[PDB]
Amino acid sequence: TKQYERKAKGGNLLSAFELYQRNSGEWFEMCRDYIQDGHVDESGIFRPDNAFYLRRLTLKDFRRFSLLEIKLEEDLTVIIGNNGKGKTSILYAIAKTLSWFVANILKEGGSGQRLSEMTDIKNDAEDRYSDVSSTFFFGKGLKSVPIRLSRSALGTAERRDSEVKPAKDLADIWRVINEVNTINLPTFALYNVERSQPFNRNIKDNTG
Amino acid sequence: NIWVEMITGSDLVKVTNDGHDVTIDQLSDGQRVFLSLVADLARRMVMLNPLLENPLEGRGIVLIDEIELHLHPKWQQEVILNLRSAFPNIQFIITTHSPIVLSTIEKRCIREFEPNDDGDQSFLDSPDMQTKGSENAQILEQVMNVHSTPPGIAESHWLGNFELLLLDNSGELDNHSQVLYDQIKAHFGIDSIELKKADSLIRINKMKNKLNKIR
Amino acid sequence: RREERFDAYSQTLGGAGRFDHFVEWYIYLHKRTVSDISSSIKELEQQVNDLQRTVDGGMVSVKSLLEQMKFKLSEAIERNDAAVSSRVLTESVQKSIVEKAICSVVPSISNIWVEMITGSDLVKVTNDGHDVTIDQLSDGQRVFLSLVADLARRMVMLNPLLENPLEGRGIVLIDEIELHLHPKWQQEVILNLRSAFPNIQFIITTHSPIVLSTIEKRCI
Amino acid sequence: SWFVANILKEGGSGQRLSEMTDIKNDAEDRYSDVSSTFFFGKGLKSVPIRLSRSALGTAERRDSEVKPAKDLADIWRVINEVNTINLPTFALYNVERSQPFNRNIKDNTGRREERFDAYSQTLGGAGRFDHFVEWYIYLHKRTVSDISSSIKELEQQVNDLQRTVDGGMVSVKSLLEQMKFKLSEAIERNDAAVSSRVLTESVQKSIVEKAICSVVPSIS
Amino acid sequence: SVIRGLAAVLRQSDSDISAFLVTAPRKYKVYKIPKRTTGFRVIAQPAKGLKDIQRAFVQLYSLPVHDASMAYMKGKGIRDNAAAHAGNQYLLKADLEDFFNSITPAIFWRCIEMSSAQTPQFEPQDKLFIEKILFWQPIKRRKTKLILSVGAPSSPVISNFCMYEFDNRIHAACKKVEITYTRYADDLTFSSNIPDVLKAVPSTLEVLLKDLFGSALRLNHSKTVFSSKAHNRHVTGITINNEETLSLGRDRKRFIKHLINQYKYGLLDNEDKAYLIGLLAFASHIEPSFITRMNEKYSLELMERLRG
RNA sequence: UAGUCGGGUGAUUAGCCAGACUCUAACUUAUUGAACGUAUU
Ligand SMILES: Nc1ncnc2c1ncn2[C@@H]1O[C@H](COP(=O)(O)OP(=O)(O)O)[C@@H](O)[C@H]1O
Ligand SMILES: [Mg+2]
């Protein structure tokens, strides 16, 4: 469409991708260059032109938090406090959100993880639901990728829906472009205290 | 160093750890757990970034809970620097209880809970003190809200009590102040910072009193 | 099996404790406190007496039931006698001792109790002023709770003749005492443990200067 | 597996193809399909089903198409719920069927008597010969016993217990209520058995015995 | 009575109006409109007969609307909305979730009952007809779920009315602490020159929403945004520049210049030309000075030729 | 420093130049309906 063409030519990634999907050259190359372009800085380190990072997180009636907002640094963010201040809760919330990107890079319409109806809703919350809201940034062509994971308490008749379509839309770009011509893909990882385990060389995974 | 041997008839990963060749099973828990983190992350980055000259310069978000887990203080002083140099474009979101780790990080990177929060706080903020390059004892008190000397130990208060006794007796060592002095000497030792402080107090207060008498 | 005295030695030197066994044992203790066996014995004695009267009245069909109930009564008396014979602390007292130990040693925990919620028994805790389940506790709080709970259970089981069973003898080995603890807790942990378990020999490992600031150089 | 799952439960799931082992290694399209067409009389000449699986990371996902199988299985399930019908048998016997016999046989909890136990591990490859032996012994016990004698005996016991409660022994009211519940359950099971239009245990036993002796030459 | 009024306006019989209204909540066409990035919005438009009735209803019955309400108001719009905040350095934006579809007959009648300003009084017999005029039934099977549809001509008026009391209260509260407040449909804007006063507004909003609507209307917490002169500030698609003036924004201006340059060399197709003309009219409304500058840059002759 | 605002230049959504701003802190959106601007009448 002419509207998508204008936005795409202005540097919008989602519009460029939409045009690629409807006409299935130019638009493919726009998408692929958006993901692959970058330069080597003065220190000899490669830097992507379009960075990917979590900008902001909001927690509503989640575990101990009634309503909490956190702004994250692009490089390093360190959370500190006494035991039971919710530091591990914060990383759990983020990991579940990232699971939606991973699921959709692996499979079209893949399902990520969910908030627990047994444990994750704040015990004395008057509304009986929780929300975890995240915004991601992917360069100036995609400044905002909003996701919300939601869950209503066990028993409650009204059920609160998650909103994950933006995660799926972005992950689709990575998956589809990669299938046509290989691109570098983002790494998502959680290392919690469960990483301290006894080692066993004898146990081998025969699964994939 | 790290390498694979097959000559015994089973595939074994070996490492040179502190100058000694050992199996992974022989590593301490602290070393193994940290090795596991880095190995896993490096593997994933290599597999996901085939087109980069240095695949460890790929993009991504990595979450680490309790980065100081099983680490000696010496290692706590290196861990964040090493990670950031090896993975320069990853966004790291980490949690810590270590002032030693905080001494290596800028204040802008730190997010701190208010001390008596109760889960209604709306926005998290950075500490007022610059942590990067600061002394650990200052970070304890100014950022982590902990006394640098344990308040529940009586001996921790002896110097304060000693000073008060000295000031009660116009700066002269009385019987009571001498007893406490001897207790400090006996407990902390002849070369202790605490005894030096006590000695200093004696010297200063004696001189102050002499000045007062001249006046 | 969790009520047997020598269950206290089960997997004692395996490295994890058995916090699962504690929870089972604690719920058990709660159920027995809410219903004592003697009233059950008295009730069973009354049922046996009523059934015996029915059999004496010519109803031979209930003789099988009488024999079963007499067996149950004998078993209840034996358990009561064995409990009596073991000179063991009452279940109420055992429960109280352990609760006090936990609350004294674990700073964030002010209370612990068993609720019947919906179908099944659940252990609840007052943690930082709020009522939560064990699975809601932070890893640091849970790990430390687990240590103390396990140790207190074993001491109660092994020291039935002491007024305070936590004043019993033993040797306890703890690797990385500061595991998951904030500096504030590191300043209290050794004092709390030694106060709760005064006659135990503790052999411990640490990386923490804060822990060391509370200990004499002779112990290091 | 898709028919069996849906006869047992609304929205039942059968088995899926493996991404690791079921997809051909050099498949250009990077997905696998297993397509089947079933026949069910002239009214339903074609019941198509497709099981599909794509490789990880493909641009498009290949999903299974199972709705026609589910629709047919739903008819069997729903019609059977209202009024008993005869149901289809599905079974796989692999080379695994050659395995030694456990002489020790398990105590009858009473899963083996339930009609839809006939679908238990039916496509696993070995049969369940152990389940046969349990079921066959069960049938024997029921044939040698009378059915409703337990009800008659239970009816007599409830009548005796009712007389005791009417005679002023209020302590046995709890036991009466338990026995009345047992009686009601027995009647309901009898009625459900009556309602389910199932063959008598004697007849079932005879049919199986004849079949075994007819097919297996050495067994008379 | 409502029926008689409508029949008179529409020059129809009472009977034919009444008959039409029986299944009016189902007389909607549902279609999709593309979003600007990816995806679609779902729209429900009433049938022509129903639209006429809805318009007649709105004409016959004046409902109160607060002055802070900027959307769907005669002689107002996005320019006025943005201008209200242009002099203030600190800005807050908030949004309501599923605004139109959250408004039910229950909410509507509650608002009528509560209203501080003078509302039309309706006979109980007319209430059922009013519900059938104003509310859409999305689910055929579920006769009990009636909601406002954005696509209906009456929905703007009803939605503004339902927010009347809300606007009254919050406007008054904001004025006491020197905060400017406006609402454009579901988009709430707050601005001030005083530091650290806008932080309290979201909490105030949540309480007020709960008080007036219970759990029916809620803030979209994901869409609550603070800004200042340190950062980009816009209000309803209009940029507020650091000289406290309304602007199209640099990117849009540069795009328009691009299109004019293309036109200068005869490279614009007719569709793009039409687009350019339309956008220049908007530019003339928001930023007339920009048009003057373009005349200077491109020759008045060229621009006049273009606007012919 | 960074981010932001944007006057100019530039076959022009880029790039470049000039000037400025900084509450912990914008992410540019939606029609055929409604309103506003322009055109037509
Ligand atoms: N659903 C809940 N409702 C209320 N409080 C909760 C809930 N879940 C957990 N908590 C509390 O939140 C804290 C959990 O801490 P956690 O997230 O593990 O933080 P940290 O890692 O800082 O110790 C404890 O104080 C626990 O009691
Ligand atoms: Mg239009």
Assess C179–D contact: CB distance below 8 Å, yes or no.
Answer: no
- Lining ligand 1 with CB less than 6 A are A 63-64, 81, 83-89, 119, 121-123; C 127-128, 130, 132, 136-140
Q: What is the residue type of D159?
A: N
- Between strands D31-40 and C200-204, the pairing is unpaired
Max CA-CA distance within chain B?
92
Question: Residue A91 and residue A132: Cα distance in Å, rounded?
Answer: 11
Secondary element (H or E) of residue B82: helix B79-86
Site of tokens 């030695």? C9
Site of tokens 């997905």? D31
Question: Residue B74 and residue B100: Cα distance in Å, rounded?
Answer: 9
Q: Which residue is nearest to nucleotide F28 (CA to C1')?
A: E237
Contact A82, B136 (CB under 8 A): no
Strand partners, B61: A188, B91
Secondary element (H or E) of residue A59: strand A52-62
| Range list of H helices, D56-128 | 67-82
Do C136 and A84 lie within an 8 Å CB cutoff?
A: no
Q: What token pair was written down for B174?
A: 């009385």
Do A146 and E222 lie within an 8 Å CB cutoff?
A: yes
Q: CA D89, D93, D97: angle at the middle one, nearest 5? A: 135
Secondary element (H or E) of residue B5: strand B2-5
Q: What token pair was written down for B66?
A: 């309790």
Q: Which of C184, D13, B93 is nearest to A75 (CA)?
A: B93
Q: Which of B110, B105, B171, B103 is nearest to B139 (CA)?
A: B103
Question: Residue A32 and residue A178: Cα distance in Å, rounded?
Answer: 9
CA distances from D57 to A105, A113, B43, C37, C42 (A): 6, 19, 18, 63, 70
Secondary element (H or E) of residue D164: helix D149-166
Q: What token pair was written down for C198?
A: 């005064």
User: How far is C-alpha A78 from the geometric centre of its chain's CA atoms?
Assistant: 19
Residue nearest to atom 13 of ligand 1 (CA): A84
Q: CA B68, B70, B72: angle at the middle one, nearest 5? A: 75
Q: What is the residue type of B149?
A: T
Residue B96's SS3 state is: coil
Sign of the Cα pseudo-torsion (B40, B46, B48, B54, in order): positive
Question: Residue E149 and residue E45: Cα distance in Å, rounded?
Answer: 8
Nearest ligand 1 atom to the CA of C140 is: 23
Q: How many helices (H) and strands (E) does chain D have?
A: 6, 2
Question: Residue E137 and residue E23: Cα distance in Å, rounded?
Answer: 10
Span from the CA of A165 to the centroid of ligand 2 (angstroms): 28
Q: Which of B86, B40, B64 is nearest to A77 (CA)?
A: B64
Site of tokens 């995660």? A167
Q: CA E258, E262, E268: angle at the middle one, nearest 5? A: 120
List, as one string, the DSSP characters of E69-117: B-TT-TT--HHHHHHTTTT-SEEEEEEBTTHHHH--HHHHHHHHHH-SS
Phi, psi of A43 (to 5 degrees): -85, 0
Strand partners, B64: A191, B94
Instruction: Give E45's contacts (C-beta < 8 A, 6+ positions apart).
Output: E28, E29, E31, E51, E149, E151, E152
Site of tokens 């068993």? C114
Contact C66, C52 (CB under 8 A): yes
Q: CA D89, D91, D97: angle at the middle one, nearest 5? A: 145
Secondary element (H or E) of residue A132: strand A129-138
Instruction: Give B59's contacts (C-beta < 8 A, 6+ positions apart).
Output: A48, A51, A52, A184, A186, A187, B89, B90
Specify the length of chain E in residues.
308
Nucleotide nearest to E150 (CA to C1'): F33
CA distances from D196 to C130, D83, D85, D111, D192 (A): 54, 8, 10, 16, 6
Q: CA C19, C22, C24: angle at the middle one, nearest 5? A: 115
* Letter string b/e over residues E150-185, b meaning 16 or more CB atoms within 10 A of that residue's CB: bbbbbbbbbbbbbbbbbbbbbbebbeeeebbbbbbb
Sign of the Cα pseudo-torsion (D131, D136, D137, D142, in order): positive
Question: Residue C175 and residue C14: Cα distance in Å, rounded?
Answer: 13
Q: 3-state secondary structure string, chain C?
A: CCCCHHHHHCCCCCCCCCHHHHHHHHHHHHHHHHCCHHHHHHHHHHHHHHHHHHHHCCCHHHHHHHHHHHHHHHHHHHHHHHHHHCCCCCHHHHHHHHHHHHHHHCCCEEEEEEEEECCEEEEEEEECCEEEEHHHCCHHHHHHHHHHHHHHHHHHHHCCCCCCHHHCCEEEEECCCCCCCCHHHHCCHHHHHHHHCCCEEEEECCCCHHHHCCCCHHHC
Q: 3-state secondary structure string, C40-53?
A: HHHHHHHHHHHHHH
| Range list of H helices, chain E | 2-10, 14-21, 48-60, 78-83, 99-102, 105-114, 124-134, 155-162, 164-176, 201-213, 250-264, 270-286, 288-298, 300-307
Residue A29's SS3 state is: helix
Give yes or no for CB of E273 within 7 Å of strand F.
no
- Between strands C109-117 and C120-127, the pairing is antiparallel
| Technique behind the model | cryo-EM
Residue nearest to atom 8 of ligand 1 (CA): A63
Contact B63, A94 (CB under 8 A): yes
Site of tokens 């220049």? E280
Give yes or no for CB of E202 within 7 Å of strand F.
no
Q: What token pair was written down for B80?
A: 């964040």
User: How far is C-alpha B22 from the geometric centre of its chain's CA atoms?
Assistant: 29
Contact A12, A141 (CB under 8 A): yes
Contact A147, A138 (CB under 8 A): no
| Range list of H helices, chain A | 2-9, 13-22, 26-36, 87-106, 165-180
Contact C138, C153 (CB under 8 A): no
Phi, psi of A187 (to 5 degrees): -100, 130
- Residues on chain C touching A123 (C-beta within 8 angstroms): 130-132, 136
Strand partners, E238: E235
Q: What DSSP designation does D121 have? A: T
Nucleotide nearest to E231 (CA to C1'): F4
Nearest ligand, measured from the Cα of A92 = 1
Contact A162, A129 (CB under 8 A): no
Q: Which of E92, E125, E120 is nearest to E219 (CA)?
A: E92
Contact C98, C149 (CB under 8 A): yes
Phi, psi of A116 (to 5 degrees): -75, 130
Instruction: Give A141's contacts (C-beta < 8 A, 6+ positions apart).
Output: A11, A12, A13, A34, A50
CA atoms within 13 A on the CB side of E75: 1
Instruction: Give A80's contacts (C-beta < 8 A, 6+ positions apart).
Output: A87, B95, B96, B97, B102, B110, B111, B112, B113, B143, B144
Question: Residue C96 and residue C209: Cα distance in Å, rounded?
Answer: 35
Give the minimum alpha-carbon distance from C47 to chain D in angstroms, rounded to a whole number.
7
Contact C140, C128 (CB under 8 A): no
Of E215, E255, E271, the CB nearest to A2: E271
* Letter string b/e over residues D43-52, b meaning 16 or more CB atoms within 10 A of that residue's CB: eeeebebbbb
Residue A146's SS3 state is: strand
Instruction: Give E153's contacts (C-beta < 8 A, 6+ positions apart).
Output: E46, E51, E54, E55, E58
Q: What is the residue type of E97?
A: E
Contact C112, C142 (CB under 8 A): no
As a dihedral over the C-alpha atoms of residue B70, residue B76, residue B81, residue B87, rounded to 10 degrees, the angle is 10
Give yes or no for CB of A24 within 7 Å of strand F.
no
The burial class, CB within 10 Å (0-12 / 13-18 / 19+), for C141 is buried
What's the order of all strands across the beta sheet hosting E238-240?
E234-235, E238-240, E246-247
Contact D206, D136 (CB under 8 A): no
Site of tokens 């504690």? C22
Question: Residue C145 and residue C137: Cα distance in Å, rounded?
Answer: 10
Angle between helices E48-60 and E2-10 (to 10 degrees): 110
Resolution, Å (one decimal) = 2.6
Question: Residue E24 and residue E18: Cα distance in Å, rounded?
Answer: 10
The burial class, CB within 10 Å (0-12 / 13-18 / 19+), for E47 is middle
Residue in chain A nearest B93 by alpha carbon: A77
Residue nearest to atom 11 of ligand 1 (CA): A64
Q: CA A101, A107, A113: angle at the middle one, nearest 5? A: 45
- Between strands B20-23 and B60-64, the pairing is unpaired
Q: What is the residue type of A194?
A: E
Sign of the Cα pseudo-torsion (A171, A172, A173, A177, in order): positive
Give the minimum alpha-carbon distance from A173 to chain D in angstroms, rounded to a whole number.
10
Q: What is the residue type of B193?
A: I
Strand partners, C173: C203
Contact E48, E98 (CB under 8 A): no
Strand partners, E190: E92, E181
Q: What is the residue type of E195?
A: P
Q: CA A106, A112, A116: angle at the middle one, nearest 5? A: 160
Site of tokens 């880095």? B38
Q: Classify D24 in phi/psi space as left (phi over 0), alpha (psi -120 to 50) or beta.
A: beta
Strand partners, C133: C124
Span from the CA of C130 to the centroid of ligand 1 (angstroms): 10
List chain F nucleotides near protein: any atom < 7 Å from a Cβ. Answer: 3-14, 19-38
Contact B59, A105 (CB under 8 A): no
Strand partners, A76: B92
Give yes or no for CB of E139 within 7 Å of strand F.
no
Site of tokens 């001491």? C155
